Protein: maltodextrin-binding protein
Organism: Escherichia coli
Amino acid sequence: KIEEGKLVIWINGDKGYNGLAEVGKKFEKDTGIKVTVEHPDKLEEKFPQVAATGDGPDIIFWAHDRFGGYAQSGLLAEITPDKAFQDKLYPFTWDAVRYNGKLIAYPIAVEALSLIYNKDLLPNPPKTWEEIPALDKELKAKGKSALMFNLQEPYFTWPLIAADGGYAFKYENGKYDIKDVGVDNAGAKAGLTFLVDLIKNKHMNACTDYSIAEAAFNKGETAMTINGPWAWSNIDTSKVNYGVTVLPTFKGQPSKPFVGVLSAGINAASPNKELAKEFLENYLLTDEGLEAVNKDKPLGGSVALKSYEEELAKDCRIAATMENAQKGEIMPNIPQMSAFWYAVRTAVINAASGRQTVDEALKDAQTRITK
Ligand SMILES: OC[C@H]1O[C@H](O[C@H]2[C@H](O)[C@@H](O)[C@@H](O)O[C@@H]2CO)[C@H](O)[C@@H](O)[C@@H]1O
């Protein structure tokens, strides 16, 4: 079970859990309350499993898209931020964590993928996906590749799929229509086909994952990668001179990354919702709390806390992140998002490996999602 008198927090392994732990230390120093920050694997799947039985951490961190499903299952406590505290955050961020209008989590920061390039290898990154193959050819001769990014999580390929028309759920009458899905439409198939062609042509490898792509970029083997702000810290420690910019266009349209808002929810079965609410509202969501997390791993292109965001939008990488966010779309938080990601994950992995054709893979995904 979840014992009272302390705080357990789950946050994904790619975020600043050491910096969050630092906010935890300051919390314990002030209240005597113990804070344990953990980053277990398959976090987004682990939480509804362990919390379905009544255990798990007291606070759960993840992008806002997974929260509607948690809420749907009664896994989250409606949060109780008073108007004063709500005033401290941008309205569209609270909106991201509204499930049927009610606040079900605290928003922390806005995330969007950008094109990250090695300035020594490519001082002038490509403006289009279509020029990437020629680029790879030229770089291959010197033992480098043009681009490597995680092909095992659809989040990373989605910008390309959405670029010429692909979409998850259509928004209509102030609501997402769970039967109007755009995963198998002409634009989605065109984007995924381009990706498969990159692989067929040996410009990318279907097996590439988050670790393989990060190591290749950080060791200077590949000129470009696609990743979010959280990844900048590790690049900073490498010897790579890099830039962060607008994603390549596809068929003349902007890549459209799905925008996520890192959010913190409170376990419905928690014996200490009070200590949770104070930790999040009075420690984490302060200029000092965010600085401590941000200092370990960048929080995103913008933060939900107005006082801190003013400072943040001070540089080119942040600018690039928000420019890509503006061309993308905020993710829905509906309960069907889990199904959408599962089906699209399988489709991209199957098309990339040749297990299914793009048309088979996406048709199947569309059916799985809507049946
Ligand atoms: O790949 C599907 C996956 O995409 C998103 O997860 C992102 C997350 O938002 C980022 O903060 C970062 O950690 O990378 C993840 C992808 O590996 C959705 O938030 C998630 O629900 C979905 O399963």
